[PDB]
Ligand binder design. Structure first.
Ligand SMILES: Nc1nc2c(ncn2[C@H]2C[C@H](O)[C@@H](COP(=O)(O)OP(=O)(O)OP(=O)(O)O)O2)c(=O)[nH]1
Ligand SMILES: Nc1nc2c(ncn2[C@H]2C[C@H](O)[C@@H](COP(=O)(O)OP(=O)(O)OP(=O)(O)O)O2)c(=O)[nH]1
Ligand SMILES: Nc1nc2c(ncn2[C@H]2C[C@H](O)[C@@H](COP(=O)(O)OP(=O)(O)OP(=O)(O)O)O2)c(=O)[nH]1
Ligand SMILES: Nc1nc2c(ncn2[C@H]2C[C@H](O)[C@@H](COP(=O)(O)OP(=O)(O)OP(=O)(O)O)O2)c(=O)[nH]1
Lengths: 481, 481, 481, 481
């Protein structure tokens, strides 16, 4: 068997080693063709038809580019072909755990369907990878190409999910620490997975990408930091690193958190929840699983993709009527109505436990306005979005090591003040979107009054259209004007 | 209510009139989200994840651009807002009739499943459009925005499929004949549908597009030709028009007729044929249809998309085992093996009626090579591809009218010699690909010997790799040496 | 005479009205072919070969696009063909006043050569425009196409330079106030000139542009604000508007203020100053002008372009030896050495009057570190860069009017807190770059010690490489540690 | 000294070895910043501001990419770092010999100014390279980095100009023959110089490029052919190779041979010829040269760039009045008028020696039409363009070697019949453009009559607009009708 070339619109011609091809040509990997990268986003950006499969190829490619570049510049690192292949495989396989409509599944559906369980796509990816290896006789192929399965499978999993539990890794030692910063960077989030989705999502969304990953690679080096060998960026690239996270935030703002994309994701999730008792997925030993329990059996999970949306949509069973009707309303674009957006002021943050109390709060507000209709808690959806630089409150650039041209082997730190006073002073905030399930004109008018009143009662920010949608309410709050 | 803006990666911001939005937001139109533009091509070019839905939006957009531009430059044409809307609707809806995996359905599956019927995507599009209008109460909406449904629905259908049967059209008169040249140009094939797929397919495939549709629009005018008002191009654009068809041929050669893309399409078609007795699709009156008969009932056809592939793949029914196994082999990349390509020589053309006799012919050849295995007719697939400039033998540029700068209202003709001696001497040819269903090394070696011998016996062209794959056969033919 | 089409890499096919063509085809306009958009930037980014001429065409094009879009959406504005042409002409002609190497001339050379005079490219553009009109018999042509020269020439000049001096404009009245916001927006800096250079500079520099001007145009409307009709943006676009200025800042940071591009601009300016007594430029009446005095006579200024660089470089006159030698050193890449960058802290701001005193201060600093060589004020260059959002300390978005979907004719305001807490807290800062004219290793080491000591003495920010370049000095300043 | 990174819009980040930087940072190399790649093309395509300098960097980059890829795939070739550097230097330096406005200088000016001499840019590049090496002490630097100047300078020159005059090369032996196929491919024209200008010219012109050089590199291998090791392409790439030449032809047709770009080049050449007696360029020993004789002294030639255009344009010397006036007319767009285009038929070919007789022939034609004015030989310009695939009549693909997947070390040939029947049947043709120096309406009408009559008299092809421009002449020729 020989290497294969794949033409990708983002990366051009990607060379795949025979071992990589063997891993790719399995039901577990090919499954990713049937899961949309941006889920409900496709229903707002028609270009975003792209799936997790092509993203995965790109991540594997870029992982190879970075590890190869480091090895070529610094032979002293002793990076090996075996190392390169393991990094590529991890890059290739770190999206294996995604479910129907990607983030919607891990972000919205599973938390509601199975609150007791803890689930992440990372854990899913490790489980799927194991299933892929075992179901397709990959281990023999790995030794054929010089890999040592026991150590290297461990190494690959560790790159995906982190320590499987002083040096916490078993797949490689401290001297090769930098290898763990390529595919999924737990230290500061600067990894090749972001680089591919920036470029790929932008290509499909029809929005341009400002981050130059090729430049980053060119300026990347490995230096000793606290007795570890780690990837360091050239000092002058610090502005570009801040911009990388800015680009991520802008993609979330324009696309991933689009108000309508989110509501479509919300509606699809509700449809899945209502279908969950009735859809069956056959797993290992012929046993039957549900959408919510397929995560327990990888054989079942292998067959859990975006297709479930169509299975529900095309169903005739009366048990599926409620779920089916929701999806049909999406098709007719009878969506829940966006009422508005606000943000908390000052120190105050909204806790995850409190999310459920929020619709009730909106319904409880007493706008001093005559209303034809009275709305109830159940008529409102409140979606809270945490926007940050990937490390909650923290500045990820405080967790980057740099080097300077006069001493390329000496790692240094750079503070925010040393860079620009125009940069963010905070690295996390919350957006609160409110929608109404009643779509009639009178209901929407009422919803706007409750919403703006709630904002005022809580001293949230004035909605941008507040003076238009609620001219009677906005005047009462002095701070607003 | 109001117009909507959609951001498209190819065209940027597309404005959709409220009437267009009403048509788009229906089950019949949204269905196109679930049908891949390039079908099996996605399995060779990972970027080609795009669906018929986004292509349809682009076609409607470009149809609007062209009709609008003509009206702005030539007020004397009396192009009306009603005309603009009807052209946009036709552009939007001319892909409604496509089936699962696009060309595979009309090009491969239906011809085999229903040889008696004559089916085209164009006919399908008209039927689906009628179903869309009737199922969603569109006619009242058309009247609201100034359309006259009887005349305008006729006009829209005519743009899609041609005369529904001296001026043959009923939707518009001879003085608006040019309007019929925008969405689906039956005169010479220069239409906005091609312009969108050139740009869109290129963007997703990762191959660059050489044709400038915007330039064409800028140089397009309407002139009187044989007592009809028709779209004419500036004389000087003739080279670019030849190049448009060159671009189309290159896209077919690189992508649409990719040997492996074609074989995947072939395998999927075989799977569908084997599943056809067992898959049920519920149509009007709760009644049940097959993949092959859903075309008879639009309610059933509405639910016939690429999902069928996954329904088969994920099935457990023993009756579907053979169909399911084919799709599973696609996943493992255990595909039928490409043996080679050849072409007829001289005046020889291969008739459609003779396609079935070809595998037998290959199996009947007697290569003077020792073979451990003997292959049979059923082990071979022979795929004949007709590559042309869209009008069989004819030069489409002979069916274009031009105008010159010194007399912009005077239509002229331009012959091929008046342009370049480097242009094609012929405008149609045939490519013949041979594959083998037995994938083992010995079988593939044998298949190569039969194939090259068959080529020699028929006086077809020497396969490009003939001296390598069949060194003992190739020497025999004098014409090849 | 008829309209002309120009193919532009940024905008595609641009249509130019015959009047515009007459203006373009003059020595005064064609001159812009010989002035680089980014001056010394070309010597760092080899792609940035582009000239002011093609930028000007793009600005004229976009000015037309915006005025046309507003008129089509809001017929009630009574925008006239005469208005459209005047806006296009202003867009076309607002770069006429640029001198050799663009910003370098107005930003560096003229302030040093002619400190008494107040010169701006805007003033230059008005003067050149007048010279263009008068020298080429344009006024008759304007009348031919329906313009009224007295009012319209005034209007065009006002768009370029602002009031020529309660409504301050004479070219158009308050009802057409929005027209003044297109070409050069004095209210908030959101104009089509920025939009072209973002796209064009990015195209040539090899840096991606993330601002979508076409989207902005689509969402732009005219609303009444304080008894003026002004351009308003859709409320939703506010994030994108903040990002427009972010993009501008990033282009300055990456490209326009590149440390080496700036030093090359500095060296070229020094060469021009040394050549100024000896280069002659023949103006009106055969009178001779200097590089520094050509601005006084437009006939002379017409012949003052980047050519002057080559005239000096290729000269043999002994008087030009010093100037010529500087340019020759640029060619050998024997440039002054970059020592580092710092910023003021707290309330501290560096005044224009204090710039020379800066080199002396650096030279005056006493490191406490032994040095082989002693450096003098004259050996240092200190370049102070004011980075802001175009309105000094002010937030330009506070000077934008918005509209909301529920009331598109009602102008509103949006504050920064209503948007994101991750946005800049400040909108202006200063960067201080230090270079050394002595390029030897010992001199450079000494320069680094003086520089970091100076930073510490002034309480400026710690240079990013401070611990590497000046390990002895960095510890002393507690604030840094 | 260390490697430098340059950001290029076409290639992104290009790494330059220190030796390459030393060569680049010389007056001889930096000169290329002041010569436009497409000469007069800039005056038709405003995007084409790019210069020979940035093209040269790209060619050096791609030369490195190809040689490095071959070495990585085939260690047995024994490609050395020394080899890589020499190939890069040749790629970098193969444009050193270009003169003002590029092709205009070698293609139009020198043939007229110095008919006795045989001059090519290739010869110029070798001379300039020698001058560069000797003037800047490069040989010691070459030795420092492991080059052997005697052998390697010879090798570099040979790559640029071919054998310096059975293996004809002295710089490398037959086992490294493939190295000579990278920078300037004398065998078939497939070289990295074309690849850069395709991409770069397209980027700037605003026309898309459809040739994928990266793909070509990926599929390139070295195989033994007639006792030489030569670069071979994968068999299936043959279509793409035909398309490479098609792309070249299309760029010539759309851009490089644009009728107006050519006439501007013609006018500039005439201006240079009229200025030649009076412009002085100071060369070695202070001696003076003319535009036409600067090619004799490299020190003078170093200072011969596009600036000559501006020196003439800005001159006041009465002796330069005639030359200056031509350039001023270009600025006013008072260009000679395009009359039309035709081609020879049958076997007819127009020799270089006969070009002079053509204007007289046109003037001699007797159209049987009444004319107000009589035109003379001197009023006509006849421009003959040879359009081919780079090898005159020959098919360059007949001079390409291929390999097949089954036997990657075995070189094969592929004939045109083996490929596509839609490909060109001829590989060379001539275009004849006629212009008139008299631009008045009566003169232009007369010119059209003479032109079409001449075409008929000679049995050339019917001009595309012939029936409009000469309705009384075209009916006469039966072949046309
Ligand atoms: N850019 C470009 N990409 C192509 C072209 N033809 C195919 N591709 C894409 C499709 C695949 O993603 C990738 C590899 O396709 P190939 O046809 O070279 O591989 P295939 O396995 O069919 O051929 P082989 O097994 O090597 O004979 O390149 C082309 O002409 N241009
Ligand atoms: N280029 C670009 N496209 C965007 C941005 N935000 C949204 N889009 C895309 C998504 C859709 O295809 C299209 C329209 O999205 P909008 O958010 O403007 O429409 P939506 O109906 O959500 O808002 P509206 O109903 O007007 O309040 O533009 C953006 O910031 N930049
Ligand atoms: N994209 C593209 N641009 C072209 C092509 N040919 C010329 N251009 C560019 C060059 C100019 O910037 C612009 C107009 O060129 P044209 O050749 O159409 O105008 P020209 O005045 O030479 O012809 P005309 O006076 O109309 O007979 O378009 C082409 O084939 N494709
Ligand atoms: N894409 C991109 N290119 C940049 C950026 N900054 C500079 N460049 C370009 C300009 C040059 O062509 C090339 C190298 O610029 P650098 O600033 O990295 O090199 P420089 O020699 O100025 O710094 P050094 O000597 O390494 O301290 O990259 C950036 O932020 N993004």
């Amino acid at each position: 068997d020989t290497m294969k070339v794949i033409n990708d619109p983002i990366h051009g011609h990607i060379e795949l080693h025979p071992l990589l091809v063997r891993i790719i040509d399995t039901p577990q990997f090919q499954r990713l063709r049937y899961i949309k990268q941006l889920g409900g986003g496709y229903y707002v950006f028609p270009g975003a038809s792209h799936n997790r499969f092509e993203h995965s190829l790109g991540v594997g490619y870029l992982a190879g580019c970075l590890v190869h570049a480091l090895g070529e510049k610094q032979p002293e690192l002793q990076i090996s072909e075996r190392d390169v292949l393991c990094v590529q495989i991890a890059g290739l396989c770190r999206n294996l755990g995604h479910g129907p409509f990607s983030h919607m599944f891990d972000g919205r559906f599973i938390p509601l369907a199975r609150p007791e369980v803890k689930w992440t796509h990372e854990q899913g990816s490790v489980m799927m990878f194991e299933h892929l290896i075992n179901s397709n006789g990959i281990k023999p192929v790995m030794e054929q190409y010089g890999l040592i399965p026991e150590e290297d499978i461990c190494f690959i999993k560790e790159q995906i999910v982190g320590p499987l539990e002083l040096w916490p890794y078993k797949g490689r030692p401290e001297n090769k620490s930098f290898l763990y910063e390529i595919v999924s960077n737990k230290r500061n989030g600067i990894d090749v997975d972001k680089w591919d989705y920036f470029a790929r999502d932008c290509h499909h969304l029809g929005i341009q990408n400002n981050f130059d990953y090729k430049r980053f690679i060119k300026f990347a080096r490995v230096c000793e930091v606290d007795n570890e060998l780690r990837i360091c960026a050239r000092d002058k690239e610090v502005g570009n690193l801040y911009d990388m996270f800015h680009t991520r935030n802008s993609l979330h703002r324009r696309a991933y958190q689009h108000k309508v994309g989110n509501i479509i994701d919300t509606m699809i999730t509700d449809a899945f929840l209502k279908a969950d008792d009735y859809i069956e997925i056959t797993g290992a030993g012929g046993k039957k699983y549900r959408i919510s329990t397929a995560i327990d059996d990888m054989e079942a999970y292998t067959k859990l993709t975006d297709n479930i949306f169509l299975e529900i949509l095309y169903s005739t069973d009366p048990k599926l009527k409620d779920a089916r009707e929701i999806l049909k309303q999406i098709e007719y674009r009878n969506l829940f109505k966006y009422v508005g957006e606000t943000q908390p002021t000052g120190q105050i943050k909204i806790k995850r436990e409190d999310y459920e109390s929020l619709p009730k709060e909106v319904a409880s507000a007493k706008p001093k306005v005559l209303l034809d209709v009275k709305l109830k808690a159940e008529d409102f959806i409140v979606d809270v979005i945490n926007m940050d630089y990937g490390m909650q409150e923290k500045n990820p650039i405080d967790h980057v090591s740099f080097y300077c041209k006069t001493a390329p082997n000496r790692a240094i730190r750079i503070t925010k003040n040393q860079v620009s006073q125009l940069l963010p002073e905070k690295f996390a905030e919350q957006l609160i979107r409110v929608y109404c399930k009643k779509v009639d004109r009178k209901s929407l008018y009422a919803a706007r009054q409750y919403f703006v009143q709630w904002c005022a009662d809580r001293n949230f920010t004035k909605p941008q259209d507040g003076d238009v949608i609620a001219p009677l309410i906005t005047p009462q709050k002095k701070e607003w004007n």
